[PDB]
Write a protein that binds this ligand. Structure first.
Ligand code: HEM
Ligand SMILES: [O]
Length: 293
């Protein structure tokens, strides 16, 4: 008995309602740009979207973005989530202004907004995630380890029903933001353009000269002359033949990367949710820049 989480739109709420919430996060993203030495809050908002979705198990429909269990001490306090309470705190003023949206709709819309606002692809979003009880919070250990190889990555992602293409498109988001040693014991950005979404991660992986070096938290990571770093799991995408081909693909076609990332990131944030046929079509939100805001 895998669980059935069916979507329930928040009462009366339509598109205008969720576009208002998107503009609140976008306007706050402009205003609070100082964060993490001017990278701003976009990156960690994408990593919260991903970490609140990525607990899912396709075998039993436990985990995932449906029930917003990240708000419970257990998951909140997971070591793999070291750092995301910056993102949770960012979102708090917004949930108080719109007390009506559910936690998983807010945690997943937060990440859509961050990608779009950083000039990433339009990501279609569907509402209806419903907050479930403290007891439904999955246990710690479901999120990936950064110290492992291509085989680890493939097998890990099979649990969320992610194929290689989907994994490499998903990993392109590591063009964003940075690893911070106090959080994960890894230190460095992956590139120059930390807070605008591009295929820079692929170009860097193929063209930078990486060196395997150990960091002050005594973990190995791959380092470039230009001040960039790759995690062992990041680097494995060029070590494996099946992944290297798709990295070389996104490296040479920015629009293919945009398109696949949008599909794969929409799927990761929808895993586990049944949508009724009567449920509305996905929303596509205008950015502030398309709204002349
Ligand atoms: C093999 C799988 C993956 C591993 C092991 C992994 C691991 C990590 C690690 C170690 C960090 C640094 C966190 C910190 O020190 O603050 C990080 C950051 C980040 N990851 Fe992942 N990640 C993986 C896949 C993904 C995917 C699929 C996405 C989303 C589409 C994602 C998005 C991000 C983002 C946006 C950050 C930036 C955080 C910030 O600057 O605040 N990661 N990840
Ligand atoms: O991540």
């Amino acid at each position: 008995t895998p669980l059935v989480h069916v979507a329930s739109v928040e009462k009366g709420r339509s598109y205008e309602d969720f576009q208002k919430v998107y503009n609140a996060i976008a306007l706050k993203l402009r205003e609070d740009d100082e964060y993490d030495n001017y990278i701003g809050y976009g990156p960690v908002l994408v990593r919260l979207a991903w970490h609140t979705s990525g607990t899912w198990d396709k075998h039993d429909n436990t985990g995932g973005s449906y029930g917003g269990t990240y708000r419970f001490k257990k998951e909140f306090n997971d070591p793999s989530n070291a750092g995301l309470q910056n993102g949770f705190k960012f979102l708090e003023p917004i949930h108080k202004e719109f007390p009506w949206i559910s936690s998983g709709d807010l945690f997943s819309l937060g990440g859509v907004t961050a990608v779009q606002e950083m000039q990433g692809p339009k990501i279609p979003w569907r509402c209806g995630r419903v907050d479930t009880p403290e007891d439904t919070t999955p246990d710690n250990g479901r999120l990936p380890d950064a110290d492992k190889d291509a085989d680890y990555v493939r097998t890990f992602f099979q649990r969320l029903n992610m194929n290689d293409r989907e994994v490499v498109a998903l990993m392109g988001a590591h063009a964003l933001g940075k690893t911070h040693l106090k959080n994960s014991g890894y230190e460095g950005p992956w590139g120059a353009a930390n807070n605008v979404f591009t295929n820079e991660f692929y170009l860097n992986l193929l063209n930078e000269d990486w060196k395997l070096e150990k960091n002050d938290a005594n973990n190995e990571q791959w380092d470039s002359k230009s001040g960039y770093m790759m995690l062992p799991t990041d680097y494995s995408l060029i070590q494996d033949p099946k992944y290297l081909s798709i990295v070389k693909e996104y490296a040479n076609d920015q629009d293919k990367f945009f398109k696949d990332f949008s599909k794969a990131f929409e799927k990761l944030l929808e895993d586990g949710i049944t949508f009724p046929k009567d449920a509305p079509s996905p929303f596509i939100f205008k950015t502030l820049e398309e709204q002349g805001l």
